[PDB]
Amino acid sequence: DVTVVYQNGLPVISVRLPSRRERCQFTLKPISDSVGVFLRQLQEEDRGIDRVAIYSPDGVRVAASTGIDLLLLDDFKLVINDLTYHVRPPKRDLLSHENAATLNDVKTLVQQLYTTLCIEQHQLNKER
Amino acid sequence: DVTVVYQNGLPVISVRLPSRRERCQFTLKPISDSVGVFLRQLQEEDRGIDRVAIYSPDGVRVAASTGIDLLLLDDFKLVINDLTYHVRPPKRDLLSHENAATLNDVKTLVQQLYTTLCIEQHQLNKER
Amino acid sequence: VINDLTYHVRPPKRDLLSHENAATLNDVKTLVQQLYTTLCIEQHQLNKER
Amino acid sequence: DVTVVYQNGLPVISVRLPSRRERCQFTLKPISDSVGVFLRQLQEEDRGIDRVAIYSPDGVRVAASTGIDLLLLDDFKL
Amino acid sequence: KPISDSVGVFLRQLQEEDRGIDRVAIYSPDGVRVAASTGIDLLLLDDFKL
Amino acid sequence: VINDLTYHVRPPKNDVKTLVQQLYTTLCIEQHQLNKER
């Protein structure tokens, strides 16, 4: 299969390469990678890949100029030399379409991480 | 059948290509992107395009270094090898009377949160 | 993997970071990026210079 | 449809191309040319062509050093 | 040259000098376009449209 | 090491807690400037 899971703030995508029947993972930096660089990286990793492409689920191809972060919002399909793989677990969570509660969900986590690490003691330690 | 859709605040053009007869979609940037490399992207996506042009519905031609902001207010005619399409884009509404003071505040706070996180790579990457 | 070998390497671990903190920091680092993509702050940032 | 005509003692292949919709003909010499020369020539004709394969009546592929007279004995898939 | 020259590269030398290169082509007399990379001896053995 | 001999040469001779502090101080100064102003 082809799947995507978040490791350490970055989406690691696991993919099944055609040659050697073995899987490879890809850690791609989404805010500055485009979907052309990712296909160049797949063809770098396994030169026997002839055709590789990304299909939006209307049958329409997504061109090689968009961002990764746009491409991981809603699902898509990935076509290697003749096989397809529809991929759905990017786990889009934005059912809110809001501003205030979505930003309160940031500092709900930030203050919880701010308590348990003795950070005010760390600031006073550096000042001392 | 060229169509322009606004997805997440960005224009997406759905062009039909002559080689693989598939609908493909390009995600444009309004300000930073221009026609002069939009045509380069349409050259990159299909090698089979011999010559491609695009111009205004009254004038003869529009040249390179023309912004998508200036083209996208008007309709325009598109020319692939033996095909001439013409497309109006839809017109975006406005919400910048009341909700702008909340929307721009959310944008400023999330951009501060982005540049808080992205900076530790960039400081070392600039130092070396 | 050198040609017909399998060198199994165990590097000395020096992280020392607790696991409960890591998922919360991961959720922050993903949600900030996802909201940065959600409403195109790169384009609004580029608008002010214009 | 793609057909082969023996004109003047030589096979001539008429192919409709994907990029520009014409029907171009290819004249090739069975004493020198090979499969890998004919598909390289068809690749040089266009640019929108990206994958090419001469198969068999069976599912197997014909390589890029087979002579043309060893190809034109039977029907084939392009 | 009869045998070592190609149609699609003789037309390059024909088109690099002049100015009217809206269309330069060689067709079969039934409207079929000949390939560019075919030879000259294969072409001049029969008739053609220039 | 050149062909035979030896030249021994002697020449003239927390990273997450700071990031979460920089991340916390973005959510705070937006209120703190209006606090300090009035």
- The domain spans of chain B are 1-91
**Shortest CA gap A126–chain C (Å):** 20
B18/D48 CB distance under 8 A: yes
Give the up-direction half-sphere exposure of residue C20: CA atoms within 13 A in the CB hemisphere: 7
Q: DSSP labels for B70-105?
A: HHTTS-EEEEETTEEEEEPPP-----TTTTHHHHHH
Q: Which two tokens stand for residue B109?
A: 């706070």
Angle between helices C19-38 and A100-115 (to 10 degrees): 160
- Chains touching A (at least 3 CB pairs under 8 A) are B, C, D, F
Facing residues of A94 across strands?
Answer: none
Q: Flag whether D touches C (3+ CB pairs, 8 A cutoff).
A: no
Pairwise CA distance, residues F30 & F38, whole Å: 14
Q: Which two tokens stand for residue B67?
A: 């912004």
The sign of the CA dihedral E29, E32, E36, E41 is negative
E23-46 b/e (C-beta count within 10 Å ≥ 16 → b): eeebebeeeebbbbbbbbebbeee
**Three-point CA angle C43, C44, C48, nearest 5°:** 115
In 10 A of CB A117, how many CB atoms? 16
**φ, ψ (nearest 5 deg) of residue A115:** -75, -50
Q: What is the CA radius of gyration of chain A?
A: 20
Q: How far is CA A79 from CA A101, B14, B118, C6, D47, in A?
A: 38, 20, 32, 32, 22
The sign of the CA dihedral B90, B95, B101, B107 is negative
Among A10, E28, A121, D51, CA closest to B20: D51
Q: Which residues of C touch F23 (CB under 8 A)?
A: 28
**φ, ψ (nearest 5 deg) of residue A66:** -80, 175
Among E48, A36, D67, CA closest to B27: A36
Pairwise CA distance, residues F4 & A19, whole Å: 49
Kind of pairing between the strands at D23-27 and B10-16 = unpaired
Residues 6+ apart with CB under 8 A from A13: A2, A3, A4, A25, A26, A28
Output the CA torsion D14→D17→D21→D27 (10° steps): -30
A59/B118 CB distance under 8 A: no
F21/A122 CB distance under 8 A: yes
Task: State whether residue A123 is helix, strand or coil.
Answer: helix
- Chains touching F (at least 3 CB pairs under 8 A) are A, B, C
Facing residues of A25 across strands?
Answer: A14
Task: State whether residue B115 is helix, strand or coil.
Answer: helix
Among A99, A102, A107, A109, which would you mutate to test the B interface (most chain B Cβ atoms within 10 Å of its Cβ)? A99
Q: How far is CA B71 from CA B62, B64, B84, B96, D34, in A?
A: 9, 12, 17, 22, 51
B vs F: CB pairs below 8 A: 11
Experimental structure resolution, Å: 3.8
In chain C, whose CA is at the least distance from the CA of B32?
Answer: C46
Put residue A116 in one of left, alpha, beta given phi > 0 → left and psi -120 to 50 → alpha. alpha
Q: Which two tokens stand for residue A45?
A: 């990793």
Q: How was this structure determined?
A: cryo-EM
Pairwise CA distance, residues A64 & B33, whole Å: 15
Pairwise CA distance, residues D74 & D70, whole Å: 9
F20/A113 CB distance under 8 A: yes
**Shortest CA gap F38–chain A (Å):** 25
Dump strand ranges (E) for D17-67.
23-27
Task: State whether residue A8 is helix, strand or coil.
Answer: coil
Residues 6+ apart with CB under 8 A from B17: B24, B45, B46, B48, B49
